Amino acid sequence: QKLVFFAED
Amino acid sequence: AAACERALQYKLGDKIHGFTVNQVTSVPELFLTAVKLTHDDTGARYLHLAREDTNNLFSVQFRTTPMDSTGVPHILQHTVLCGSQKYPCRDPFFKMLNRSLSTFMNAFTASDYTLYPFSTQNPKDFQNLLSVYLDATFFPCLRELDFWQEGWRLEHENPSDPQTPLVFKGVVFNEMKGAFTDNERIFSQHLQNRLLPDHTYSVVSGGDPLCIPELTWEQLKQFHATHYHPSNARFFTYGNFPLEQHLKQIHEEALSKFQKIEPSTVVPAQTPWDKPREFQITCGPDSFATPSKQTTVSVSFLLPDITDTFEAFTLSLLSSLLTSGPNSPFYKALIESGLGTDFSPDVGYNGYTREAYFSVGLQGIVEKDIETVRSLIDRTIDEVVEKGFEDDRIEALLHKIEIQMKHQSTSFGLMLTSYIASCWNHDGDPVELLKLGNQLAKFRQCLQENPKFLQEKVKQYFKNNQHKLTLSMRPDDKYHEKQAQVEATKLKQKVEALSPGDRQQIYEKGLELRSQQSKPQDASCLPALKVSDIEPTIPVTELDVVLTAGDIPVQYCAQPTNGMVYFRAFSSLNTLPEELRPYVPLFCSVLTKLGCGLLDYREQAQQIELKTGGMSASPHVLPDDSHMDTYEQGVLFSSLCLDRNLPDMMQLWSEIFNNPCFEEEEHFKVLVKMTAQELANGIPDSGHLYASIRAGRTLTPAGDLQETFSGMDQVRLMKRIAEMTDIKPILRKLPRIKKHLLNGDNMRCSVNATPQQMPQTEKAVEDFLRSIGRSPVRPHTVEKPVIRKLVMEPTFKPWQMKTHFLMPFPVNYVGECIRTVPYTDPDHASLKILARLMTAKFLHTEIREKGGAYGGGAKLSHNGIFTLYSYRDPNTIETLQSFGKAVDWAKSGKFTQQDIDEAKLSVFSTVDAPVAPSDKGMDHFLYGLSDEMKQAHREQLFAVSHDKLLAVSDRYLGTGKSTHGLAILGPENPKIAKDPSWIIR
Ligand SMILES: [Zn+2]
């Protein structure tokens, strides 16, 4: 869909 | 028609919807035509990659240069997706996840840029996503309460009782808390900050948990106005969709409202040091094994700008020659020295920053040996300068890149925009990174002209570079406890400064936010697809199975693999004694690394890297589709090679099966100590998985077996072996496993290749099968139709279990598993819809939005296990309570028909995801699912109705109706400890 949550470091 | 062909018809200077074609370049090695455009009015840059690929991708990139560790570009990235002018409704992003058939939808924040990519195969869905992304990034409603939810906020423990104490909450606040649960990530962060201490690279772009609450709403709005102007943007598209449609949409919706500015966002060049530096930092203790060999040390070198593409490409190759594989100088010097357990974090070439950097070092060393390591690094550099590299390793590396270039992925557009982002961010030419044929050619020429080319390069950047950084890290047993202490002070400092008027507003605003998260709102301003837009049937996958040598089935699948061959083999574990089962993952991880025949592990590694793309073995538990207590246990051998090196690959497999070297004991300890180290470091990032696997161990035989193979039991076991003073008794177990595994008694194989290559493969594979030996412990064995032999445990009784792993974490990982029904049961489809339904409309709201946890939802596996989970959760008990309230919500039926349709869209976006030529059709090869079974299951997902959702929620998810399993990774919880129904490990 995809990769629901959003990153990063 | 075709896509790369049509792009070549573009003339330089062509004006298209506010854009001008500046360059058109054909990159035949990637089957694409690159097109550079510039927006006339804004100066915005555009890169279009035209290729006959239906999985089209869009991305927009902003240069974001923070000057503090507030995490403001990260929180902004979260907040711009919380509402826009054209779509003022709450949370357009998460809502569109269930209103689209996308293949990808996310956002990322690097150190100096923010990236918003999405991909889909539906052209109408592309336009819809394109309008929402453009409006979100350029015209966000930056409402104060959306900032309070995604960033950080002050809130009462009960938002309705203003007599309860105020606490910190926020999604990013907990996202970054859990991000720095990883010690490697702590080390990585400090490395970059100390090595590049002049500008934006000196800060924590993602957010330092202690500096996040220093961020105001105004700073967030100012930061957006400064950095999210199209003049500071890079636009990117990839695929077969008409470029004109994209430009017309981008220009008329967003870019037209702006005029050219000169962005104050340039990252200056790091001024090189005259003298090296040393720094010492601290980290968290170990999860959860042993206590003096726990120091991490590294040495880092500053490299030139990545905008110098060939020199960057050169130094990247040079970096692989130096650290990759057991034939690399630093491997023989540091790893095989027995001083540490593995390489330090971020080893090799790091090209995310403007100036790239190289790092090498060890972790798991005693602090007294720090100078020893540094001397080795010093000595190794001297030797490489004097001796250089062997030609066959240079050939091996170039062969690997050739494979990476020819291989066919499903997310090609995503890799490309990620691969060019850093170079593009600093005004480099992203197209020059694409012409790999040229860089390979020039690299070869640069070697043929100067035999000491690489030796002078190492000399320049390692022996003469005064810009060296030595960084060492030792853990602190109270690290996270100390962090909480300072956090408690900053909290009190913030509460003390509150005026009575301030305190009333926080109460009221907090109550308003809670209201926003609860009140069911309208999302009709959002574009959406319908269930009618989902294809009713799947494209048939064509196979032919041939019994060979003399009854081993081999599955052949003709695919456009672009001159690549993919070989897989599955050997059952039914003859294997149960005593040796926990040692099979270990066995598989060393099988192809210990040497074969006349090849020592060094020589063997050279062949594998020169002839194949990799050969691996891994243990698998494949659940049956019609019986919860039936499964297939075995090892999957996987390998890959170019068309021309096919016989070498199968010859390698033959020698590994017939003469593996289980006598290399010294290298064996190295691999074990390395695998154990890697497994322990990866627990936090996959904490919910380790939680889910433990929770489901007592529900299914397969679940029980999966815990043995990849659970905390496997992590703990590996750690014990790495602590063994006498490794021989483990080493003797491998020949015993070899005699049950490496033969042709219980085997089936698969081959994926081009139709032109297929007959050649049929020979090499058949020759391989004849060269391995020929001629079960458990009741019973079932034959299931061309025949798979599965283990059945019909007396398996599921048993309830709750487990709390005491980890020194600042965040938690929760998993609850429920034993339901398998794939072929008609209720399974209902459960599949229900899982995403509960996630989209309940658990996401409770666990993430209200709680502040980074991730939380429900999924249903092939094995019929319904799992509820939370990821980086500040809560534990409240999370479990939300699990119970979710099923009660599911039983209430208080959800609409539109919610069911959105759940269906979300489900089909996952199962109809694109399959790489190398993976068709693994579903048949692994799980034994025909096209018939999938269509039947696909039409069941279509027939799922509201009454079936109520029936199935009451039938399986209710308390006492089915068997549950619980597991928690996180710090001590007094409430859990006083519960006798919980086990502490
Ligand atoms: Zn994030």
Short mmCIF file of C-alpha atoms in Angstrom, two decimals, chain B residues 494-872:
data_model
loop_
_atom_site.label_atom_id
_atom_site.label_comp_id
_atom_site.label_asym_id
_atom_site.label_seq_id
_atom_site.Cartn_x
_atom_site.Cartn_y
_atom_site.Cartn_z
CA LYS B 494 8.20 23.60 31.57
CA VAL B 495 5.31 23.16 34.03
CA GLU B 496 6.75 25.69 36.49
CA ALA B 497 6.85 28.32 33.75
CA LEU B 498 3.12 27.86 33.08
CA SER B 499 0.80 30.73 34.02
CA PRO B 500 -2.76 30.06 35.25
CA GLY B 501 -4.02 31.18 31.84
CA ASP B 502 -1.49 28.88 30.20
CA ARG B 503 -2.68 25.96 32.34
CA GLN B 504 -6.31 26.47 31.38
CA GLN B 505 -5.46 26.61 27.68
CA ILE B 506 -3.44 23.38 27.89
CA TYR B 507 -6.39 21.69 29.57
CA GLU B 508 -8.85 23.04 27.00
CA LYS B 509 -6.61 22.51 23.94
CA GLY B 510 -5.76 19.03 25.20
CA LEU B 511 -9.48 18.34 25.49
CA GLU B 512 -10.03 19.70 21.99
CA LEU B 513 -7.34 17.45 20.56
CA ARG B 514 -8.88 14.45 22.29
CA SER B 515 -12.20 15.51 20.77
CA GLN B 516 -10.65 15.73 17.29
CA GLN B 517 -9.30 12.18 17.55
CA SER B 518 -12.69 10.76 18.60
CA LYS B 519 -15.30 12.68 16.61
CA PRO B 520 -16.10 10.82 13.35
CA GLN B 521 -15.46 13.31 10.54
CA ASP B 522 -16.05 13.53 6.78
CA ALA B 523 -13.37 12.75 4.19
CA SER B 524 -15.36 13.38 1.00
CA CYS B 525 -13.06 16.15 -0.04
CA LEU B 526 -10.54 13.43 -0.59
CA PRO B 527 -10.28 11.60 -3.93
CA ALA B 528 -10.84 7.84 -3.79
CA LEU B 529 -10.98 4.65 -5.81
CA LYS B 530 -13.76 2.07 -5.51
CA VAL B 531 -13.91 -1.71 -5.19
CA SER B 532 -15.01 -1.72 -8.84
CA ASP B 533 -11.51 -0.47 -9.69
CA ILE B 534 -9.96 -3.69 -8.39
CA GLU B 535 -9.27 -6.33 -11.04
CA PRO B 536 -11.63 -9.31 -10.53
CA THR B 537 -9.08 -11.94 -11.61
CA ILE B 538 -5.30 -12.35 -11.38
CA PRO B 539 -2.99 -12.99 -14.37
CA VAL B 540 -2.25 -16.73 -14.56
CA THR B 541 1.31 -17.75 -13.70
CA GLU B 542 2.63 -20.29 -16.20
CA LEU B 543 4.68 -23.23 -14.91
CA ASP B 544 5.99 -26.63 -16.00
CA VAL B 545 7.18 -29.23 -13.49
CA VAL B 546 9.66 -31.88 -14.63
CA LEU B 547 10.68 -34.86 -12.49
CA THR B 548 14.47 -35.24 -12.63
CA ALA B 549 17.16 -37.54 -11.17
CA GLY B 550 15.07 -39.55 -10.92
CA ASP B 551 11.87 -38.29 -9.30
CA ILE B 552 12.92 -34.94 -7.84
CA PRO B 553 10.43 -32.32 -9.03
CA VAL B 554 11.88 -29.19 -10.61
CA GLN B 555 9.73 -26.14 -11.26
CA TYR B 556 10.55 -24.00 -14.30
CA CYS B 557 9.13 -20.49 -14.65
CA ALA B 558 9.96 -18.46 -17.76
CA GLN B 559 10.40 -14.78 -16.88
CA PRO B 560 12.05 -11.61 -18.24
CA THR B 561 14.94 -11.86 -15.78
CA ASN B 562 17.27 -9.88 -18.07
CA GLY B 563 19.98 -12.52 -18.42
CA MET B 564 19.67 -13.64 -14.80
CA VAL B 565 19.09 -17.12 -13.35
CA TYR B 566 17.46 -17.75 -9.97
CA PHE B 567 17.82 -21.19 -8.43
CA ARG B 568 16.08 -22.42 -5.31
CA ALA B 569 16.03 -25.75 -3.52
CA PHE B 570 14.00 -26.99 -0.58
CA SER B 571 15.16 -29.93 1.53
CA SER B 572 12.83 -31.28 4.20
CA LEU B 573 13.77 -31.63 7.87
CA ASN B 574 11.58 -34.66 8.52
CA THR B 575 14.48 -37.09 8.92
CA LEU B 576 16.35 -34.73 11.25
CA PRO B 577 16.61 -35.60 14.97
CA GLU B 578 14.86 -33.03 17.16
CA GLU B 579 17.96 -32.47 19.31
CA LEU B 580 19.68 -30.70 16.40
CA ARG B 581 16.81 -28.42 15.39
CA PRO B 582 17.90 -25.31 17.28
CA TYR B 583 21.28 -25.58 15.55
CA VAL B 584 19.89 -25.57 11.99
CA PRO B 585 19.75 -21.77 11.61
CA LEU B 586 23.37 -21.70 12.74
CA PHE B 587 24.12 -24.53 10.31
CA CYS B 588 22.53 -22.67 7.40
CA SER B 589 24.38 -19.46 8.16
CA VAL B 590 27.83 -21.06 7.94
CA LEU B 591 27.20 -23.76 5.32
CA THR B 592 28.27 -21.48 2.47
CA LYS B 593 31.07 -19.73 4.38
CA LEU B 594 33.32 -22.52 5.69
CA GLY B 595 34.85 -23.71 2.42
CA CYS B 596 34.06 -26.47 -0.08
CA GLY B 597 36.31 -29.14 -1.56
CA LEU B 598 39.69 -27.65 -2.40
CA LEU B 599 38.47 -24.18 -1.47
CA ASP B 600 39.22 -22.68 1.93
CA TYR B 601 36.73 -20.11 3.23
CA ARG B 602 38.76 -17.31 1.63
CA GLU B 603 38.96 -19.08 -1.73
CA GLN B 604 35.30 -20.09 -1.57
CA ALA B 605 34.25 -16.51 -0.89
CA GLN B 606 36.18 -15.37 -3.96
CA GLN B 607 34.32 -17.79 -6.23
CA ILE B 608 30.87 -17.03 -4.85
CA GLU B 609 31.37 -13.29 -5.31
CA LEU B 610 32.90 -13.74 -8.80
CA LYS B 611 30.43 -16.26 -10.24
CA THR B 612 27.17 -15.86 -8.32
CA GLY B 613 25.15 -12.99 -6.89
CA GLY B 614 25.03 -14.87 -3.63
CA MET B 615 24.28 -18.33 -2.31
CA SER B 616 22.41 -18.71 0.96
CA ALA B 617 20.63 -21.26 3.10
CA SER B 618 17.84 -20.53 5.58
CA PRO B 619 15.43 -22.59 7.69
CA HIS B 620 11.72 -22.22 6.95
CA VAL B 621 8.46 -23.19 8.62
CA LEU B 622 5.71 -23.34 6.01
CA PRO B 623 2.24 -23.69 7.55
CA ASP B 624 -0.42 -25.78 5.83
CA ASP B 625 -3.40 -23.89 4.40
CA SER B 626 -6.14 -26.15 5.78
CA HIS B 627 -4.85 -27.38 9.14
CA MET B 628 -3.50 -25.19 11.93
CA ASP B 629 -1.41 -28.03 13.36
CA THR B 630 0.12 -29.06 10.04
CA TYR B 631 3.30 -27.56 8.60
CA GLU B 632 6.30 -28.12 6.34
CA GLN B 633 9.77 -27.85 7.85
CA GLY B 634 12.90 -27.51 5.75
CA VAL B 635 15.80 -25.44 4.47
CA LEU B 636 15.63 -23.19 1.43
CA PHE B 637 18.79 -22.97 -0.64
CA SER B 638 18.83 -19.86 -2.80
CA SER B 639 21.36 -18.69 -5.36
CA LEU B 640 21.61 -16.29 -8.25
CA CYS B 641 23.89 -15.80 -11.27
CA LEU B 642 24.32 -14.29 -14.73
CA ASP B 643 23.43 -16.45 -17.74
CA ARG B 644 27.08 -17.19 -18.53
CA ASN B 645 28.15 -18.26 -15.03
CA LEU B 646 25.31 -20.74 -14.52
CA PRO B 647 27.46 -23.90 -14.61
CA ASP B 648 29.83 -22.44 -11.99
CA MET B 649 26.93 -21.77 -9.61
CA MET B 650 25.57 -25.31 -9.81
CA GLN B 651 29.12 -26.65 -9.48
CA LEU B 652 29.49 -24.60 -6.32
CA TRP B 653 26.27 -26.12 -5.01
CA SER B 654 27.50 -29.62 -5.82
CA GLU B 655 30.73 -29.16 -3.90
CA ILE B 656 28.95 -27.58 -0.95
CA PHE B 657 26.58 -30.56 -0.83
CA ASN B 658 29.31 -33.19 -1.28
CA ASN B 659 32.42 -31.73 0.39
CA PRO B 660 31.75 -28.93 2.90
CA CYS B 661 34.62 -28.06 5.27
CA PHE B 662 33.23 -28.43 8.81
CA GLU B 663 36.81 -28.38 10.10
CA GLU B 664 37.54 -24.67 9.79
CA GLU B 665 37.07 -24.01 13.48
CA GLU B 666 38.84 -20.68 13.82
CA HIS B 667 36.73 -18.95 11.18
CA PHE B 668 33.67 -20.68 12.62
CA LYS B 669 33.96 -18.82 15.93
CA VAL B 670 34.29 -15.57 13.98
CA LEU B 671 31.04 -16.18 12.11
CA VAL B 672 29.21 -17.21 15.29
CA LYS B 673 30.44 -14.25 17.33
CA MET B 674 29.44 -12.03 14.39
CA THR B 675 25.95 -13.50 13.88
CA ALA B 676 25.22 -13.28 17.61
CA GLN B 677 26.30 -9.64 17.71
CA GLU B 678 24.13 -8.74 14.72
CA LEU B 679 21.12 -10.56 16.13
CA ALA B 680 21.31 -8.78 19.50
CA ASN B 681 21.70 -5.32 17.95
CA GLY B 682 18.61 -5.76 15.80
CA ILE B 683 16.17 -6.63 18.58
CA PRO B 684 14.79 -3.12 19.23
CA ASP B 685 14.13 -2.32 15.55
CA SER B 686 12.25 -5.62 15.20
CA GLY B 687 10.95 -5.70 18.77
CA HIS B 688 7.31 -6.19 17.83
CA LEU B 689 8.28 -9.18 15.69
CA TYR B 690 10.18 -10.87 18.53
CA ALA B 691 7.14 -10.06 20.67
CA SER B 692 4.72 -11.55 18.15
CA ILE B 693 6.78 -14.72 17.64
CA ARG B 694 6.94 -15.41 21.39
CA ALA B 695 3.24 -14.66 21.83
CA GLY B 696 2.38 -17.22 19.16
CA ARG B 697 4.75 -19.98 20.28
CA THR B 698 2.09 -21.70 22.36
CA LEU B 699 -0.66 -21.53 19.72
CA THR B 700 0.74 -23.50 16.77
CA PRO B 701 3.40 -26.19 16.23
CA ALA B 702 4.75 -23.97 13.45
CA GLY B 703 4.73 -21.01 15.82
CA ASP B 704 6.60 -23.16 18.32
CA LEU B 705 9.13 -24.05 15.64
CA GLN B 706 9.47 -20.47 14.42
CA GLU B 707 10.38 -19.41 17.95
CA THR B 708 13.17 -22.01 17.93
CA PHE B 709 14.47 -20.77 14.56
CA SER B 710 14.24 -16.97 14.85
CA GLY B 711 12.83 -16.11 18.26
CA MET B 712 14.55 -14.81 21.36
CA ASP B 713 15.41 -18.45 22.01
CA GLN B 714 17.52 -18.40 18.86
CA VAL B 715 19.09 -15.09 19.86
CA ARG B 716 19.83 -16.39 23.35
CA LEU B 717 21.20 -19.70 22.02
CA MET B 718 23.57 -18.02 19.57
CA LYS B 719 24.85 -15.77 22.36
CA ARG B 720 25.64 -18.78 24.58
CA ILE B 721 27.57 -20.48 21.75
CA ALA B 722 29.54 -17.26 21.22
CA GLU B 723 30.41 -17.38 24.93
CA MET B 724 31.62 -21.01 24.76
CA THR B 725 35.30 -21.50 25.48
CA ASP B 726 35.31 -24.87 23.71
CA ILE B 727 33.42 -24.52 20.42
CA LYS B 728 34.13 -28.06 19.19
CA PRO B 729 31.00 -29.80 20.58
CA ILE B 730 28.78 -27.43 18.55
CA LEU B 731 30.99 -27.87 15.50
CA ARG B 732 30.55 -31.65 15.65
CA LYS B 733 26.79 -31.20 15.30
CA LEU B 734 27.13 -29.91 11.72
CA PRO B 735 28.12 -33.20 10.04
CA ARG B 736 25.10 -34.80 11.71
CA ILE B 737 22.85 -32.13 10.21
CA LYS B 738 24.69 -32.46 6.89
CA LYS B 739 23.78 -36.14 6.49
CA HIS B 740 20.07 -35.40 6.87
CA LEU B 741 19.97 -32.17 4.88
CA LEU B 742 22.50 -32.11 2.03
CA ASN B 743 21.08 -34.89 -0.14
CA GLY B 744 18.31 -35.58 -2.66
CA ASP B 745 16.00 -37.72 -0.54
CA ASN B 746 13.36 -35.11 0.32
CA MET B 747 13.84 -32.36 -2.25
CA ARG B 748 12.15 -30.06 -4.75
CA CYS B 749 13.69 -27.25 -6.80
CA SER B 750 12.68 -24.16 -8.76
CA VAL B 751 14.29 -22.26 -11.64
CA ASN B 752 13.49 -18.74 -12.82
CA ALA B 753 15.11 -17.62 -16.06
CA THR B 754 14.56 -16.22 -19.55
CA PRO B 755 12.88 -18.64 -21.99
CA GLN B 756 16.04 -18.48 -24.12
CA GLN B 757 18.11 -19.74 -21.18
CA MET B 758 15.75 -22.45 -19.91
CA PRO B 759 17.13 -25.48 -21.80
CA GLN B 760 20.70 -24.75 -20.64
CA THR B 761 19.49 -24.56 -17.03
CA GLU B 762 17.64 -27.87 -17.28
CA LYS B 763 21.00 -29.57 -17.87
CA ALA B 764 23.09 -27.88 -15.17
CA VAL B 765 20.32 -28.39 -12.61
CA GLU B 766 19.93 -32.05 -13.61
CA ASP B 767 23.70 -32.52 -13.37
CA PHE B 768 23.62 -30.96 -9.89
CA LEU B 769 20.83 -33.28 -8.73
CA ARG B 770 22.68 -36.43 -9.83
CA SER B 771 25.85 -35.45 -7.97
CA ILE B 772 24.24 -35.60 -4.51
CA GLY B 773 23.62 -38.67 -2.35
CA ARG B 774 20.51 -40.84 -2.21
CA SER B 775 19.12 -43.64 0.01
CA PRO B 776 10.81 -39.72 9.57
CA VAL B 777 11.01 -39.21 13.34
CA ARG B 778 7.51 -37.80 13.90
CA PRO B 779 3.96 -39.23 13.79
CA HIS B 780 2.48 -38.50 11.53
CA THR B 781 3.45 -37.70 7.96
CA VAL B 782 0.78 -36.56 5.53
CA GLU B 783 1.00 -36.78 1.76
CA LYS B 784 -0.53 -33.69 0.19
CA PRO B 785 -0.82 -33.26 -3.58
CA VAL B 786 4.13 -33.49 -7.04
CA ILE B 787 3.92 -34.50 -3.37
CA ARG B 788 4.94 -32.64 -0.21
CA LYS B 789 5.49 -34.52 3.07
CA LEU B 790 4.22 -32.51 6.02
CA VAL B 791 4.52 -32.95 9.77
CA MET B 792 1.18 -33.27 11.55
CA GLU B 793 0.81 -32.93 15.31
CA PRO B 794 -2.90 -33.70 15.82
CA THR B 795 -2.54 -33.83 19.61
CA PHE B 796 -1.16 -30.31 19.79
CA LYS B 797 -2.92 -28.39 22.50
CA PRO B 798 -2.65 -24.62 22.47
CA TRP B 799 -1.99 -23.11 25.89
CA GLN B 800 -2.32 -19.52 27.12
CA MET B 801 0.92 -17.70 27.88
CA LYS B 802 2.05 -14.17 28.79
CA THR B 803 5.70 -13.13 28.65
CA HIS B 804 7.57 -9.96 29.62
CA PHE B 805 11.17 -9.65 28.43
CA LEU B 806 12.98 -7.25 30.78
CA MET B 807 14.87 -5.01 28.38
CA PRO B 808 16.64 -1.74 29.22
CA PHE B 809 14.46 0.18 26.76
CA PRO B 810 12.80 3.60 27.00
CA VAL B 811 9.90 2.22 24.95
CA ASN B 812 7.78 -0.94 24.71
CA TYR B 813 6.82 -3.56 22.12
CA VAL B 814 3.54 -5.39 22.64
CA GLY B 815 2.09 -8.39 20.84
CA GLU B 816 -1.14 -10.32 21.31
CA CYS B 817 -1.80 -13.42 19.19
CA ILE B 818 -5.05 -15.32 18.67
CA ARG B 819 -5.49 -18.76 17.09
CA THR B 820 -8.15 -18.51 14.37
CA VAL B 821 -8.66 -20.38 11.08
CA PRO B 822 -6.38 -21.18 8.13
CA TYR B 823 -6.31 -19.83 4.56
CA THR B 824 -8.91 -22.08 2.92
CA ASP B 825 -11.55 -21.45 5.58
CA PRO B 826 -14.18 -18.97 4.28
CA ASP B 827 -13.95 -17.04 7.57
CA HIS B 828 -10.26 -16.35 6.91
CA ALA B 829 -11.07 -13.72 4.30
CA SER B 830 -13.39 -12.01 6.79
CA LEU B 831 -10.64 -11.96 9.43
CA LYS B 832 -8.24 -10.51 6.86
CA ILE B 833 -10.62 -7.61 6.16
CA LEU B 834 -11.36 -7.23 9.87
CA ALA B 835 -7.67 -6.96 10.78
CA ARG B 836 -7.03 -3.96 8.52
CA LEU B 837 -10.46 -2.55 9.39
CA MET B 838 -9.61 -2.59 13.10
CA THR B 839 -6.21 -1.08 12.33
CA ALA B 840 -7.49 1.75 10.15
CA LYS B 841 -10.47 2.74 12.31
CA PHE B 842 -9.52 1.86 15.89
CA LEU B 843 -6.00 0.77 16.85
CA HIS B 844 -4.23 3.46 14.84
CA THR B 845 -6.33 6.09 16.62
CA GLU B 846 -5.97 4.65 20.14
CA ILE B 847 -2.39 3.40 20.18
CA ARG B 848 -0.71 5.90 17.85
CA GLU B 849 -2.72 9.14 17.77
CA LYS B 850 -3.82 9.25 21.43
CA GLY B 851 -1.08 7.16 23.01
CA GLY B 852 1.87 8.48 21.03
CA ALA B 853 3.17 5.08 19.99
CA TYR B 854 4.91 4.99 16.63
CA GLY B 855 3.01 2.01 15.26
CA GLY B 856 0.05 -0.11 16.27
CA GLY B 857 -2.38 -2.35 14.43
CA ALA B 858 -3.60 -5.83 13.61
CA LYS B 859 -2.61 -8.43 11.03
CA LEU B 860 -3.63 -11.94 10.02
CA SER B 861 -1.02 -14.41 8.87
CA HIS B 862 -1.25 -17.31 6.43
CA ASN B 863 -1.13 -19.64 9.44
CA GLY B 864 -4.40 -18.21 10.74
CA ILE B 865 -2.80 -16.28 13.58
CA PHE B 866 -4.54 -13.00 14.39
CA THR B 867 -1.94 -10.67 15.89
CA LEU B 868 -2.39 -7.30 17.58
CA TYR B 869 0.80 -5.30 18.07
CA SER B 870 2.33 -1.99 19.14
CA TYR B 871 5.68 -0.57 18.03
CA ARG B 872 7.74 1.81 20.19
#
